[PDB]
Subunit: 37 residues, 6 copies
């Protein structure tokens, strides 16, 4: 109940964080490419 619910909230937050980390990684690659020329 309480434990399962907290774990579901943790899972959801980590999914959102993973998506944002992916988007950030792509942008960082674009920065590297722009600075290389």
């Amino acid at each position: 109940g309480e434990i399962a619910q907290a774990l579901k909230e943790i899972a959801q937050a980590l999914k959102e964080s993973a998506k944002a980390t992916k988007e950030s990684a792509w942008a960082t690659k674009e920065i590297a490419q722009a600075l290389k020329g």
Copy 2:
């Protein structure tokens, strides 16, 4: 209980971290766009 309470604190910290990671990603996209 003690386990449930710790897990709620973990959930809250991860929610805050997810929000900050999103804001960082948006700003990094803006940097990429400015440099392109």
Copy 3:
């Protein structure tokens, strides 16, 4: 217990990480603003 104690340490590390991620996000926004002009 041992499980509760480990979870408290996890909570504390995640709180510290969240604070640092927020500070980093703010600085990244400032970089974006400086590069936009």
Copy 4:
């Protein structure tokens, strides 16, 4: 169970995040190298 299932989802999200963090680290190293 419900607990096991949530933990499997947590594991999967963290695997994806670890991969992205690695890719980001490599790109950040390339930025450092470009700037000198």
Copy 5:
């Protein structure tokens, strides 16, 4: 035992990650300061 042990390893990895995130945040602030000036 197995659960407690895994949780201790998780705690340790998160402590290391938090320290590195803090150091990164400081460096990002320095980047922002350099680009503002």
Copy 6:
């Protein structure tokens, strides 16, 4: 078994993430140093 196994996978992913975060922090420090002069 299932809970312990998921926790071991979580531990392993977090170890990998910590290593990458450390490498990223070092590179960010190098960027700060390059931009400072």
